[PDB]
Amino acid sequence: YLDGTLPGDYGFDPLGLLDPTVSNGQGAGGFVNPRWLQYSEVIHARWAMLGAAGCIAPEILGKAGVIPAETAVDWFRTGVIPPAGVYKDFWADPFTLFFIEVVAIQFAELKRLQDYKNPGSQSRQYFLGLEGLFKGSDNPAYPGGPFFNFANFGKTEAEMKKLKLNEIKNGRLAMLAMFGYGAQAVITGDGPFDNLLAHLADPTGANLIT
């Protein structure tokens, strides 16, 4: 059933979750289906594309002389998992920032969900004049618009398909990387860049086998 029309189709579905036989009826139903799984693949990718860039950027810039070493700290010692460590000097405590996080996000996320349940629904109601930017598209993962694609890149359809899968190939790689950051940290107890600096120095001596 994998025709290959999709961007990131390379014929790898051993367990057959994307088949159209499952969820035969019509309705909302369950989450295992082509409409939701295709959507969550890029969402896990985009969030991971941001995370893997940010988990290693302060450490690299810290080894370099640009950023102060006080701020340059391992991604797991910056406030998450306070047993690991906690940055004392922010402009506010973590829990105050979490309420900022929960609020400003839960607008963004639930507004996106209603567009999945009811396309174009968020433009119809008044939202401080920002309604023109949320018109959406046929595919919810790639809405586009005056903001999300403010610089219209793929005016041609063929160029979009090339970009639509470069978003995935560069993205599915990042998901693996973050899985490496978590596993590296537990065993090594050090940042991801310092672990690289060791394998380049003593590869045979610094390794998972060790």
Chain residues in the site for other proteins (CB under 8 A)? 16-17, 19, 21-30, 32, 83, 91-93, 95-96, 99, 110-111, 114-115, 117-118, 121-122, 124-127
User: Are the C-beta atoms of 137 and 120 separated by less than 8 Å?
Assistant: no
Residue 54 in tokens: 């940010």
Question: Is 9 one of the annotated binding-site residues?
Answer: yes
**Residue 91 CA, distance from chain mean position:** 26
Count Cβ atoms within 10 A of the Cβ of residue 12 and give its class: 0-12 exposed, 13-18 middle, 19 or more buried. exposed
- Minimum CB distance to other proteins, residue 67 (Å): 23
Counting Cα atoms < 13 Å in the Cβ hemisphere of 140 gives: 22
Residue 65 in tokens: 């002389």
Residue ranges in 171-210 that form contacts with ligand CLA under rule CB under 6 A: none
Stretch that binds ligand XAT, among 64-72, 76-84, 104-112, 184-192 (CB under 6 A): 76-84
Residue 27: name its binding partner from ligand XAT, other proteins, ligand CLA, none (Cβ under 5 to 8 Å by kind): other proteins
Residue 175: name its binding partner from other proteins, ligand XAT, ligand CLA, none (Cβ under 5 to 8 Å by kind): ligand XAT
Q: How far apart are CA 116 and CA 110, in angstroms?
A: 10
141 closest CA partner among 173, 174, 163, 125: 163
Question: Is 46 one of the annotated binding-site residues?
Answer: yes
- Minimum CB distance to ligand XAT, residue 49 (Å): 9
Round the CA-based radius of gyration of the chain to a whole number and report it: 21
Candidates 13, 43, 71, 159: give the one binding ligand CLA (CB under 6 A): 71
Q: Cβ atoms within 10 A of the Cβ of 141, count?
A: 16
Q: Binding mask 19-58 vs ligand CLA (x if CB under 6 A, - otherwise)? A: ---xx------xxx-----------------xx-xx--xx
Residue ranges in 153-182 that form contacts with ligand XAT under rule CB under 6 A: 175-176, 178-179
194 closest CA partner among 204, 181, 175: 181
Candidates 1, 12, 95, 126: give the one binding ligand XAT (CB under 6 A): 12
Residue ranges in 25-44 that form contacts with ligand XAT under rule CB under 6 A: 44
Question: Is 162 one of the annotated binding-site residues?
Answer: yes
Question: Is 41 one of the annotated binding-site residues?
Answer: yes
Residue 34 in tokens: 């082509």
